[PDB]
Enzyme design. Sequence first.
Site, PDB file in Angstrom:
ATOM      1  N   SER A  45     -18.564  19.572  18.482  1.00 32.10           N
ATOM      2  CA  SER A  45     -19.719  20.431  18.257  1.00 32.10           C
ATOM      3  C   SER A  45     -19.754  21.090  16.882  1.00 32.10           C
ATOM      4  O   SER A  45     -20.766  21.732  16.571  1.00 32.10           O
ATOM      5  CB  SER A  45     -19.882  21.493  19.345  1.00 32.10           C
ATOM      6  OG  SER A  45     -20.222  20.905  20.584  1.00 32.10           O
ATOM      7  N   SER A 212     -15.128  21.114  20.801  1.00 36.20           N
ATOM      8  CA  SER A 212     -14.042  20.587  21.620  1.00 36.20           C
ATOM      9  C   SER A 212     -14.486  19.306  22.306  1.00 36.20           C
ATOM     10  O   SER A 212     -15.683  19.018  22.426  1.00 36.20           O
ATOM     11  CB  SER A 212     -13.503  21.620  22.633  1.00 36.20           C
ATOM     12  OG  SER A 212     -14.431  21.836  23.685  1.00 36.20           O
TER      13      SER A 212
END
Length: 263
Positions: A45, A212
């Site tokens: 992200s 993540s």
Amino acid sequence: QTSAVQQKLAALEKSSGGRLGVALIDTADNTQVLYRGDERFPMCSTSKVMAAAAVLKQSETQKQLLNQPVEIKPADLVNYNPIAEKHVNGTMTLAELSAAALQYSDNTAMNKLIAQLGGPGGVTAFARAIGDETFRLDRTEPTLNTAIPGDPRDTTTPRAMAQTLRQLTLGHALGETQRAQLVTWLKGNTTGAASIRAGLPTSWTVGDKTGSGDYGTTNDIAVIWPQGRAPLVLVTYFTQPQQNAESRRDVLASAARIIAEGL
Ligand SMILES: O=C(Nc1cccc(-c2nnn[nH]2)c1)c1cc(-c2ccccn2)cc(C(F)(F)F)c1
Ligand SMILES: O=C(Nc1cccc(-c2nnn[nH]2)c1)c1cc(-c2ccccn2)cc(C(F)(F)F)c1
């Protein structure tokens, strides 16, 4: 050469079992500290910064672009949609999608930013246009987070991402109002207190974007305003050899602490 900071980062990495990538730019003197700075890592992200910035760039020639309503349908929801799910069968503006992607890490919002840019390659094209020859976005959410070792898709290097984050937030890759908007969004992130920020003195101001994925991949990219000195840009990327590995935000904090101690 290997500096004292690089040897500390190597010791941290060894104890962690994973692979750590760090890039610092100190804008006071433009010096850089790198650890695996030219190796590729899955962005996860942290790539949302590039997508939001690309839309901000489009908005420089369209004053109403950020207020344009975008439809959210039930079929659009993916695997983490804390903001977009409240808008299903309604609309969100591109500003709302940008804020949701950046500050809440909403994956549906990210997909709308990618679609506005014409697909993952539109994000890569913006990266090239601002001088980043390394970044590549190849997939949408959620599969861009597979984070498979050796896979080039959806990766960059710490060096490239730190340079790009600097140009976007402190330099002139965006117009002044758009740069300020990106900084405001980053400073309002909700997800970052356990990552880079947990390794820094509490008086310092941070804007960041976490990421993540699989393989215990745990990432953060930040702009940092230390008390009394010029800003820093810091990228910390971490990934692990086993698919099911747990997240390790503490490793990012530890890398940030080593970096701060070396200043
Ligand atoms: O939503 C997330 N991860 C996700 C989503 C969908 C499926 C799966 C999945 N699939 N198989 N195993 N997990 C995992 C996510 C995780 C985090 C986190 C927090 C604390 C520690 C580790 N990570 C933080 C954030 C945010 F947004 F708050 F920064 C989002
Ligand atoms: O979408 C995902 N994670 C997510 C979603 C939203 C925000 C953030 C976030 N933001 N800041 N930090 N994390 C992270 C995602 C997670 C996984 C995974 C698997 C196994 C263990 C952990 N994770 C696998 C996959 C896929 F699809 F690639 F297999 C996607």
